[PDB]
Amino acid sequence: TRSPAWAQAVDPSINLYRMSPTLYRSALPNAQSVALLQRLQVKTVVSFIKDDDRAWLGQAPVRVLSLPTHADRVDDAEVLSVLRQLQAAEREGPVLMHSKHGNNRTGLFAAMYRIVVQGWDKQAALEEMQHGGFGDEDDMRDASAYVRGADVDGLRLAMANG
């Protein structure tokens, strides 16, 4: 992230980056991350894996939105459902979305947010996904594969409908 438009680093230990005052991406957080998440005033923690975040969250007054998935199985239908739930969660306050390593599944949905919601073109979002410090491209084969060949116009159109 040297382009100021890319996600800014907050906590590289858990791969935590800021996309906006109301949206954060990261890897799997722990008990030590709770304090920081409350500074950022996170109200919703979206997870793309099965690990019950309520375990490390403790009695933190945040909503848990579990959306467990597999990057090699995601399609346009799942993406739209996630983007809608992310947007709705943003209206309630700042949101953290995460996975195991926060560069494949997270990198996929992050890039799609850039394209569908913020109106970035496909390659711009890709350049932030593969380069930006989230990981190396070997970790993102599934994510990279989907972003390419994804009908961005059909996604934006279907998004504008609902």
Author numbering: 34 to 195
Paper text:
TpbA is a dual specific tyrosine phosphatase (DUSP) that has a conserved tyrosine phosphatase domain, and relevant phosphatase activities with p-nitrophenyl phosphate (pNPP) and phosphotyrosine peptides have been reported. TpbA (PA3885) from P. aeruginosa PA14 has been reported to be secreted to the periplasm and to link the extracellular quorum-sensing signals to EPS (extracellular polysaccharide) production and biofilm formation via negative regulation of c-di-GMP (3',5'-cyclic diguanylic acid), which regulates biological processes including motility and biofilm formation in bacteria. TpbA adopts a canonical eukaryotic-like DUSP fold with additional secondary structure elements that distinguish it from other DUSPs, including an N-terminal β-strand β0 that caps and extends the β-sheet, and a C-terminal helix α6 that packs on the outside of the protein. The active site architecture of the DUSP catalytic domain is defined by four loops: the protein tyrosine phosphatase (PTP) loop containing the conserved catalytic cysteine Cys132; the general acid loop containing a conserved aspartic acid that functions as a catalytic acid/base; a variable insert that varies among DUSPs and is predicted to involve in substrate recognition; and the α4-α5 loop that is equivalent to the Q-loop in protein tyrosine phosphatases (PTPs).
In an attempt to provide a structural basis for the phosphatase mechanism, we co-crystallised a C132S mutant of TpbA with pTyr on the basis that a C132S mutant of TpbA was previously reported to be inactive by Koveal and colleagues. The TpbA C132S mutant co-crystallized with pTyr shares the same crystal form as native TpbA with two molecules in the a.s.u. Comparison between the wild-type and C132S-pTyr structures reveal an r.m.s.d. of 0.35 Å for 162 aligned Cα atoms, indicating no major differences between the two structures. Close inspection of the electron density maps for the C132S-pTyr structure revealed phosphate alone was present in the active site. In one of the two monomers, however, clear electron density was visible for tyrosine in the shallow binding pocket approximately 5 Å from the bound phosphate, indicating that pTyr had been dephosphorylated. The tyrosine is trapped close to the active site, and its position overlaps with that of a glycerol molecule in the wild-type structure. The trapped tyrosine stacks adjacent to His76 and is coordinated by a 3.1 Å hydrogen bond between the carbonyl oxygen and the amide group of Ala104, and a 2.5 Å hydrogen bond between the amide group and the side chain of Asp175. The side chain of Asp105, the proposed general acid/base, is approximately 3.8 Å from the amide group of the trapped tyrosine, and a weak electrostatic interaction (3.6 Å) is provided between the carbonyl oxygen and the Nε atom of Arg138.
